[PDB]
Amino acid sequence: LSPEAITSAQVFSTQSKETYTYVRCWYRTGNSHDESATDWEWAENPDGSYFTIDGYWWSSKNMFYTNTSQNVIKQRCEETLGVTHDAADITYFAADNRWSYNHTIWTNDPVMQADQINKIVAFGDSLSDTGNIFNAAQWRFPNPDTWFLGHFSNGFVWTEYIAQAKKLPLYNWAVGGAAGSNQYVALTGVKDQVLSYLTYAKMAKNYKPENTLFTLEFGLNDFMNYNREVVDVKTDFSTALIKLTDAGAKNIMLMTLPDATKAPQFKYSTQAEIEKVRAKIVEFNEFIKAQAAFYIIQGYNITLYDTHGLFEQLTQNPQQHGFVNASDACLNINRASSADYLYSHSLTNECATHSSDKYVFWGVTHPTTAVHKYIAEKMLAPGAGMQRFNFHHHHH
Ligand SMILES: [Cl-]
Numbered sequence: 001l002s003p004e005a006i007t008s009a010q011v012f013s014t015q016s017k018e019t020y021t022y023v024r025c026w027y028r029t030g031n032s033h034d035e036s037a038t039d040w041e042w043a044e045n046p047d048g049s050y051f052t053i054d055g056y057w058w059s060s061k062n063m064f065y066t067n068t069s070q071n072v073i074k075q076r077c078e079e080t081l082g083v084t085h086d087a088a089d090i091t092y093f094a095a096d097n098r099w100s101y102n103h104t105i106w107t108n109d110p111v112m113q114a115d116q117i118n119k120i121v122a123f124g125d126s127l128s129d130t131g132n133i134f135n136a137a138q139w140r141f142p143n144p145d146t147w148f149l150g151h152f153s154n155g156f157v158w159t160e161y162i163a164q165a166k167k168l169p170l171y172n173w174a175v176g177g178a179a180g181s182n183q184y185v186a187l188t189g190v191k192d193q194v195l196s197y198l199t200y201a202k203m204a205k206n207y208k209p210e211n212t213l214f215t216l217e218f219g220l221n222d223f224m225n226y227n228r229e230v231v232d233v234k235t236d237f238s239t240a241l242i243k244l245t246d247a248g249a250k251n252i253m254l255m256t257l258p259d260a261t262k263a264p265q266f267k268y269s270t271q272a273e274i275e276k277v278r279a280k281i282v283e284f285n286e287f288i289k290a291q292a293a294f295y296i297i298q299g300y301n302i303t304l305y306d307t308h309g310l311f312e313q314l315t316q317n318p319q320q321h322g323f324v325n326a327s328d329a330c331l332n333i334n335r336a337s338s339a340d341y342l343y344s345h346s347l348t349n350e351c352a353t354h355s356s357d358k359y360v361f362w363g364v365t366h367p368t369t370a371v372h373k374y375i376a377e378k379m380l381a382p383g384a385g386m387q388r389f390n391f392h393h394h395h396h
Contacts, residue, residue, distance in 0.1 A: 017056040022043070126181075142178075210249070254288055265364035323371075330356045
């Protein structure tokens with residue numbers, strides 16, 4: 001994909017449609033983070049008639065571009081579903097009918113625009129993906145009775161918690177590369193996510209890349225699942241940042257990688273493999289830090305969060321940080337098999353007793369949503385760096 005391949009005539013033709021579609025509103029059916037299952041209803045107008053949004057489609061995996069705000073769509077979903085239990089965790093997508101997959105709704109920007117951040121765009125892997133590999137797998141991977149609707153967790157991931165805190169739209173380009181992902185879409189670099197995003201952004205209206213907050217975390221699935229070499233992940237990561245900044249990005253959040261060798265799946269690994277993967281993470285994290293320093297010197301607005309250090313603290317002494325267990329999967333999974341993401345799994349007795357909000361790990365690989373929230377809160381804290389970005393205020 002290349003944004004340069006899109007012509008002015010193509011942009012005009014695409015934007016000249018003004019069709020309509022419906023909104024699928026998803027929600028968690030159970031009343032805590034222990035239960036990942038979800039269901040949906042069509043969004044409704046206040047009188048119960050079906051809600052529609054006007055706009056146009058584009059696909060190079062179709063996105064719907066509308067002038068209806070994300071806040072209004074969310075409100076319609078909340079009013080329609082009327083969930084009164086905790087952890088409703090509502091999300092929504094465009095869909096013409098029940099056979100459609102979950103398409104992202106993009107709210108076009110207005111002509112009148114200053115310098116405030118007006119959306120978050122996320123790049124990365126299974127620590128950030130909110131539904132891309134899930135759509136590519138026709139909703140079979142990860143299994144949606146046990147992993148929360150296309151997220152590799154029991155709920156929202158860190159980018160979603162940041163977006164919620166700042167009252168911003170989140171548009172996700174991250175692609176899960178966890179074990180078993182190979183079967184739905186060949187491994188691609190994070191630079192290919194940047195290229196794809198820029199092609200979709202060419203169809204947006206009044207889009208100013210300097211008003212996007214970009215998030216980038218990558219490399220964990222590459223080292224753990226694809227045995228990639230550090231020099232190749234460095235090249236992919238550097239290329240992505242060159243392309244993103246060349247396209248006009250100014251505001252980027254970077255993070256170091258957690259030491260994933262502390263995850264339960266490495267109970268089934270050799271010490272040699274633990275040492276090999278760990279050394280790659282250590283080396284790659286220094287490259288992330290050097291890239292951040294470089295882009296700061298070049299004049300960009302960069303934050304760098306040391307997720308590696310936060311995660312070392314959580315796995316070393318979970319109780320100091322509000323967790324009870326950082327060594328075991330919450331799910332009753334007693335092996336490290338790619339196939340396990342295809343099946344449903346129950347909580348262990350111990351996780352059910354203490355609750356999944358007290359565990360660091362959901363399955364054998366990924367953090368629980370309580371950890372994702374903990375990461376987001378650390379990143380949002382005063383002095384942690386986000387003050388350098390131009391956020392809107394909201395009196396509510
Ligand atoms: Cl997992």
